[PDB]
Design a protein around this ligand. Structure first.
Ligand SMILES: *[C@@H]1O[C@H](CO)[C@@H](O[C@@H]2O[C@H](CO)[C@@H](O[C@@H]3O[C@H](CO)[C@@H](O)[C@H](O[C@H]4O[C@H](CO)[C@@H](O)[C@H](O)[C@@H]4O)[C@@H]3O)[C@H](O)[C@H]2NC(C)=O)[C@H](O)[C@H]1NC(C)=O
Ligand SMILES: *[C@@H]1O[C@H](CO)[C@@H](O[C@@H]2O[C@H](CO)[C@@H](O)[C@H](O)[C@H]2NC(C)=O)[C@H](O)[C@H]1NC(C)=O
Ligand SMILES: *[C@@H]1O[C@H](CO)[C@@H](O[C@@H]2O[C@H](CO)[C@@H](O)[C@H](O)[C@H]2NC(C)=O)[C@H](O)[C@H]1NC(C)=O
Ligand SMILES: *[C@@H]1O[C@H](CO)[C@@H](O)[C@H](O)[C@H]1NC(C)=O
Ligand SMILES: *[C@@H]1O[C@H](CO)[C@@H](O)[C@H](O)[C@H]1NC(C)=O
Ligand SMILES: *[C@@H]1O[C@H](CO)[C@@H](O)[C@H](O)[C@H]1NC(C)=O
Ligand SMILES: *[C@@H]1O[C@H](CO)[C@@H](O)[C@H](O)[C@H]1NC(C)=O
Ligand SMILES: *[C@@H]1O[C@H](CO)[C@@H](O)[C@H](O)[C@H]1NC(C)=O
Ligand SMILES: *[C@@H]1O[C@H](CO)[C@@H](O)[C@H](O)[C@H]1NC(C)=O
Ligand SMILES: *[C@@H]1O[C@H](CO)[C@@H](O)[C@H](O)[C@H]1NC(C)=O
Ligand SMILES: *[C@@H]1O[C@H](CO)[C@@H](O)[C@H](O)[C@H]1NC(C)=O
Ligand SMILES: *[C@@H]1O[C@H](CO)[C@@H](O)[C@H](O)[C@H]1NC(C)=O
Ligand SMILES: *[C@@H]1O[C@H](CO)[C@@H](O)[C@H](O)[C@H]1NC(C)=O
Ligand SMILES: *[C@@H]1O[C@H](CO)[C@@H](O)[C@H](O)[C@H]1NC(C)=O
Ligand SMILES: *[C@@H]1O[C@H](CO)[C@@H](O)[C@H](O)[C@H]1NC(C)=O
Ligand SMILES: *[C@@H]1O[C@H](CO)[C@@H](O)[C@H](O)[C@H]1NC(C)=O
Ligand SMILES: *[C@@H]1O[C@H](CO)[C@@H](O)[C@H](O)[C@H]1NC(C)=O
Ligand SMILES: *[C@@H]1O[C@H](CO)[C@@H](O)[C@H](O)[C@H]1NC(C)=O
Ligand SMILES: *[C@@H]1O[C@H](CO)[C@@H](O)[C@H](O)[C@H]1NC(C)=O
Ligand SMILES: *[C@@H]1O[C@H](CO)[C@@H](O)[C@H](O)[C@H]1NC(C)=O
Ligand SMILES: *[C@@H]1O[C@H](CO)[C@@H](O)[C@H](O)[C@H]1NC(C)=O
Lengths: 125, 122, 442, 125, 125, 122, 48, 48
């Protein structure tokens, strides 16, 4: 079934947990009582579609691991790679970087737009 | 009815950051149609451009003051702010905030509506 | 030197606490299985390791959601049934005279009254037996519910037997279990396990003597929102059954009276046999050992040397003063005073027999304006239930003095559901994540 | 905070308005009264999904500015680049070619199909 | 005018029917009576979104003819290309490999995940 | 039952466009299975292929008449039209419209069902 | 059916041909019983 | 002044003021409400 091994790597480190993104990814979609299940299904569909729209706006459409080209400001986190991928878990990382998430989202959006414009004017020639 | 109002300290000790917030009642900063400039005029002199800010944060300052100034526009409350660092005696001037219909290729830089104008002595 | 850049990961295992609307998963009755989803035959449980999750049974939205669901289900199930508006008439009643018992005196009354029939321009005269709790003096008596609201009869076909209802979660959400033994509901749980759907949560309704449910696995457990404060209730979960036998030794007869075009009123006719009070039997040794385990567990949290006293119900409404429950459509209000009458201090075959009172006009929830009329059940009723918990409240004002008094309490039905919905928590996944990594798109 | 400048560039020229496409893309997705809200949400989801399917059929999936390889027939509009991107707005342009839209969509669809077939044929070799 | 030949190439061979995928692909999206109609719409939307998610997990997002690098084990089928594309129809092919479908989907999923991981490792350098 | 009917002017002045319309009651033109041909037969001569049209518009005409002919096919009303430009005195013929199961390549080009056959004299 | 009479206590000239003291029998909580009740009904509400 | 067709008299005319005209209505009578039971639970409120 699609529920097999759901989450699972919650306690795993970020590096180890990054190898099982498909399992979590494929589980995000699937008289008054009818309006309950129906509304829940519509809500899940809306959330998934919004998340997919955000990914497409960032240019990572149809990709699970798609790393962008915007620089990482050291203010968000001064930790080095060895101390995050092999020493921290995803839940702790999310709890750490929560205040700077929207700024990074905006930076990704503007970077993708600028890249699209650059490609457009390059292809114009 | 569209206009702009400036606020901030009218007198400051001339060695620190100088903050001046211009808020616009009328058009919205979020809309990508207008640039928001910070023209200045010292007494007995002409106007002098300082910098401008767009809704997407692509700001540009005067080359003379490219180091001592920073313009930050917040669209949640629809205003913008000028932070002029290392202020000296040359900054005693009236700090106008102007609207430019450059957003949209209809016309070039065409400052049309100007703020009240606050004289920030220093 | 670092040259590290932002990277976005999809399907990340990150969750946040959230409240949503759970739905059915079952496998005619008041707990309608028709509008409830079928359950898979192979439930999947994904054990999560090295995860500590903060649970709080007292802030679970799922229990309130279940309470509203149960109330709505009952209201829907009562819709297609006859309304007993004509029943509000003046009843001419007399005492029951045949084969009277001393305990069963000042009880079921032979009432007669005029009621409508199939034809509007006629009035039949009918007799029936009505319990004392149902009627009230206006030699004239009226139904207790007349001056509150006209309320509907319960259809005989639908059964009130609890049926398990597995509460699954929508897509994108998850239900986290807590298998960690010796868990007091609140606080961190280190043994978290995702479950597609919950276990059997049989919607049994009762007070102070929580019937069929999930027993503890290690020993008796005591849970309370703030044990220092005596206002909050205390849930006690047993680790062994305290099996109870509640019965109505009165062979009853049901007669159908036609009150309208197709509407039928089911009334208690003959009581052939001998009149005898319904009784609840609890084993003596089993209750003694279970209460001793309860005593030890309470003494753990209330000093090693203290006097604890188990007294009977304080008072209030009959629902919030006796052990109410349903076994075969007849609602036994078995009064619990012998069970909670003892004192414990630092240091064969007979079984107790509680008194019970049958009632037909029922206001199960804390609502005014709606009732039911349980039809009489032919024959004898025996349900042989499982007592697997209690709700006890501490009497405040005892100060630092060693005296302590735990008495039966409750009234609110959320506590009944909270005992079987404590290990479960509802979370929502956040598949999007951002991290550093050596990358550049182009 | 997501609304934050919806439309805005309606009066701007086409070229300038093309630089703020993202702001107009994030807001396209997000007893009987519950039915009202549910139907509104489902209609919005259906419209967004139809638009996304139409974009994907042309090969422009996950792109805000994606330009194809089909030619611009002069019959659709004789206006030149200097007078369309710097002198006309998007509403006027849409009103001008409102009745020449379906054939363009069909040409894009068949061109994308032919491109995919040619890619398959080339890669088979 | 979107129906326009739905399932037109049902009896056609696989090779011939593969040239009209867009016709069949564009029609997947479009008191108690309103409830039933809205539930049907929501079911169609959910099916389409699950389909799109399954396609995207394999890296074939935004492509109607996407061919991957997973080898074709001869155990699943022994018929050659000449007897498949020129001698068989799509319904017969679906009935023939109806019991070897899940393993192919799984193989595609792990192949795409491995490809993404290898691309990330190569691009890190 | 599937059958085609041809309509149009049975007599036209030479030296301008001649329009014929073949409409099929039966297999739909939109279906990507059949090609719709326009075989012609002059008196005292054999058959002569003119052109064919597919549901997706990939038409192909005879090399002899690649310039003087235009075949269109509209699926909303399920018919297809032939426009022969600059018809001469040699175009007096019976203009059949035929169906080919070339699409769905079980078999090669094979005209199985034919229209009634309209005789145009110019 | 209502048995109504004109008001007479502290009546003003403008409020004449107006709210009427009506009395009538009505059902009660017990089906086999009736009660005589009264109310002041505005003229626009009632009609002969 | 706004109207769909001011030339045609059939259509209504909406006049929107620029300042408000303060207007105060009142019913000086001090009425009383009495609840009489017309059935089980249902109660009718009457003028006293
Ligand atoms: C707690 O757990 C106990 C564990 O047994 C549970 O006792 C069960 O009570 C139900 C109450 O309905 C019993 O069900 C009845 O069983 C008898 C004997 O088998 C049947 O004759 C009954 O039939 C009724 O329904 C029929 C239609 O289906 C009618 O035609 C008929 O006239 C009756 O009305 C009914 O099915 C059940 O048997 C017991 N369990 C056992 C093992 O006997 C108890 O209900 C649980 N809850 C509480 C609050 O005690
Ligand atoms: C407002 O929009 C109008 C047109 O919508 C603009 O008019 C154009 O102005 C430019 C520069 O003067 C001319 O080159 C164009 O020919 C004009 N076009 C039309 C249709 O009038 C006008 O400039 C805009 N004004 C502002 C302040 O943006
Ligand atoms: C209709 O379909 C059948 C098969 O379903 C076709 O029969 C095939 O004909 C070709 C001739 O070249 C043979 O090579 C195949 O072996 C035949 N199929 C089978 C299963 O034996 C038939 O040609 C089709 N007819 C039309 C008009 O399309
Ligand atoms: C990572 O953390 C600090 C520098 O950020 C340093 O002490 C440590 O050695 C680093 N790790 C490695 C492997 O160098
Ligand atoms: C029934 O018995 C009770 C016992 O208290 C008594 O009060 C009552 O009067 C009896 N009924 C009649 C009708 O006398
Ligand atoms: C109740 O009274 C009726 C007469 O109204 C009589 O026929 C019936 O036997 C009585 N039943 C009991 C149990 O007293
Ligand atoms: C039923 O009707 C009879 C008719 O005489 C009457 O005597 C009796 O009191 C009625 N029953 C009531 C009011 O309960
Ligand atoms: C209904 O009548 C009973 C019996 O007299 C009484 O106890 C109760 O308070 C009454 N309810 C109301 C709402 O007056
Ligand atoms: C009551 O507990 C006993 C103890 O094993 C068990 O066998 C029985 O099934 C339980 N009955 C219920 C929960 O109805
Ligand atoms: C429950 O246990 C936690 C530690 O696991 C403790 O902090 C808390 O006080 C306990 N609460 C009660 C009511 O026992
Ligand atoms: C429990 O009640 C006491 C009353 O003194 C209070 O101080 C304490 O904060 C309460 N517990 C919690 C968790 O708030
Ligand atoms: C109860 O009465 C019915 C009526 O005939 C009888 O069939 C049944 O056996 C009685 N119950 C017992 C336990 O004898
Ligand atoms: C309950 O106990 C009493 C007295 O011990 C006994 O007479 C009766 O039969 C018992 N009933 C049940 C159901 O155990
Ligand atoms: C309840 O009844 C059953 C069977 O009649 C019996 O086995 C059990 O011991 C009884 N419960 C007691 C005596 O607590
Ligand atoms: C049982 O509770 C009632 C009400 O709280 C009380 O009056 C009575 O005294 C209690 N029983 C005993 C034996 O004290
Ligand atoms: C329960 O029974 C005991 C013993 O007879 C009695 O003292 C108590 O009052 C009863 N409960 C109530 C609420 O009357
Ligand atoms: C459009 O621009 C082209 C550029 O060379 C020019 O040739 C043409 O005349 C222009 N047309 C109009 C209508 O301005
Ligand atoms: C299509 O729209 C253009 C826009 O002006 C117009 O000139 C033309 O006549 C229209 N054609 C048809 C067939 O409607
Ligand atoms: C009440 O007064 C009106 C107005 O004078 C009169 O027409 C009407 O007859 C009066 N009502 C009665 C019952 O006389
Ligand atoms: C109310 O009933 C009495 C009893 O007969 C009758 O005299 C009176 O007229 C009735 N009231 C009406 C008809 O308004
Ligand atoms: C308004 O009404 C008059 C009535 O004579 C009519 O002539 C005129 O056409 C109407 N206005 C419009 C805009 O049609």
């Amino acid at each position: 079934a699609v529920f097999l091994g759901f989450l699972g790597a919650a306690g795993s480190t970020m590096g180890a947990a990054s190898m099982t993104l498909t399992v979590q990814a494929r589980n995000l979609l699937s008289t008054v009582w009818g309006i309950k299940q129906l509304q829940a299904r519509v809500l899940a569909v809306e959330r998934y579609l919004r998340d997919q729209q955000l990914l497409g706006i960032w240019g990572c459409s149809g990709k699970l691991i798609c790393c962008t080209n915007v620089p990482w400001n050291s203010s968000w986190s001064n930790r080095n790679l060895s101390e995050i991928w092999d020493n921290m878990t995803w839940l702790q990382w999310d709890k750490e970087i929560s205040n700077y998430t929207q700024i990074i989202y905006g930076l990704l959006e503007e970077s993708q737009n600028q890249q699209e414009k650059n490609e457009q004017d390059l292809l114009a020639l | 009815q569209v206009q702009l109002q400036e606020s901030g300290p009218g007198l400051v000790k001339p060695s620190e950051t100088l903050s001046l917030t211009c808020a616009v009642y009328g058009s919205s900063i979020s809309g990508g149609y207008f640039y928001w400039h910070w023209i200045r005029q010292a007494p007995g002199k002409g106007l002098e451009w300082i910098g401008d800010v767009y809704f997407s944060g692509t700001t540009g300052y005067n080359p003379s003051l490219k180091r001592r100034v920073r313009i930050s526009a917040d669209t949640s409350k629809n205003q913008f702010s000028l932070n002029l660092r290392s202020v000296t005696a040359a900054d005693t001037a009236v700090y106008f905030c102007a609207r430019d219909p450059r957003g949209g290729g209809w016309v070039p830089n065409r400052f049309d509506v100007w703020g009240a104008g606050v004289l920030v002595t220093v | 030197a670092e040259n590290l850049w932002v990277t976005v990961y999809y399907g990340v295992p990150v969750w946040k606490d959230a409240e949503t609307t759970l739905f059915c998963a079952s496998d005619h009755n008041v707990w309608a299985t028709h509008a409830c989803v079928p359950t898979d035959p192979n439930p999947q449980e994904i054990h999560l390791e090295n995860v500590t999750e903060e649970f709080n049974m007292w802030k679970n939205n799922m229990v309130e959601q279940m309470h509203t669901d149960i109330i709505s289900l009952w209201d829907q199930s009562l819709k297609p049934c006859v309304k007993l508006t004509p029943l509000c008439v003046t009843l001419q009643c007399t005492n029951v005279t045949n084969n009277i018992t001393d305990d069963m005196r000042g009880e079921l009354k032979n009432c007669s009254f005029n009621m409508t029939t199939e034809l509007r321009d006629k009035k039949q005269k009918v007799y029936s037996l009505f319990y004392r709790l149902d009627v009230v003096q206006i030699k004239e008596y009226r139904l207790i519910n007349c001056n509150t609201s006209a309320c509907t009869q319960a259809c005989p076909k639908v059964s009130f037997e609890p049926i398990p209802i597995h509460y699954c979660a929508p897509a994108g959400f998850a239900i986290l279990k807590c298998k960690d033994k010796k868990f007091n509901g609140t606080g961190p749980c280190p043994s978290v396990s995702t479950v597609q759907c919950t276990h059997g949560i049989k919607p049994v309704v009762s007070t102070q003597l929580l019937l069929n449910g999930s027993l503890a696995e290690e020993e008796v457990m005591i849970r309370s929102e703030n044990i220092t404060n005596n206002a909050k209730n205390i849930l006690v979960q047993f680790n062994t059954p305290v099996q109870i036998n509640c019965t109505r030794p009165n062979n009853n007869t049901r007669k159908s009276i036609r009150i309208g075009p197709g509407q039928a009123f089911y009334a208690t006719g003959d009581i052939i046999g001998d009149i005898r009070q319904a009784h609840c039997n609890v084993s003596k040794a089993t209750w003694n050992e279970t209460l001793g385990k309860v005593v030890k567990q309470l003494r753990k949290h209330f000093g090693n040397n203290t006097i604890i006293r188990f007294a009977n119900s304080s008072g209030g409404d009959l629902e919030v003063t006796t052990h109410s429950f349903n076994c075969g459509g007849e609602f036994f209000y078995c009064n619990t005073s012998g069970l909670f009458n003892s004192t414990w201090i630092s240091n064969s075959n007979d079984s107790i027999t509680l008194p019970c009172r049958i009632k037909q006009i029922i206001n199960m929830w804390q609502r005014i304006g709606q009732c039911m009329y349980a039809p009489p059940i032919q024959g004898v009723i025996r349900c042989v239930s499982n007592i697997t918990g209690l709700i006890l409240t501490r009497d405040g004002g005892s100060t630092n003095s060693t005296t302590e008094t735990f008495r039966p309490g409750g009234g609110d039905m959320r506590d009944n559901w909270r005992s079987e919905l404590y290990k479960y928590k509802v979370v929502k996944i956040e598949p999007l994540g951002v991290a550093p990594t050596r990358c550049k798109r182009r």
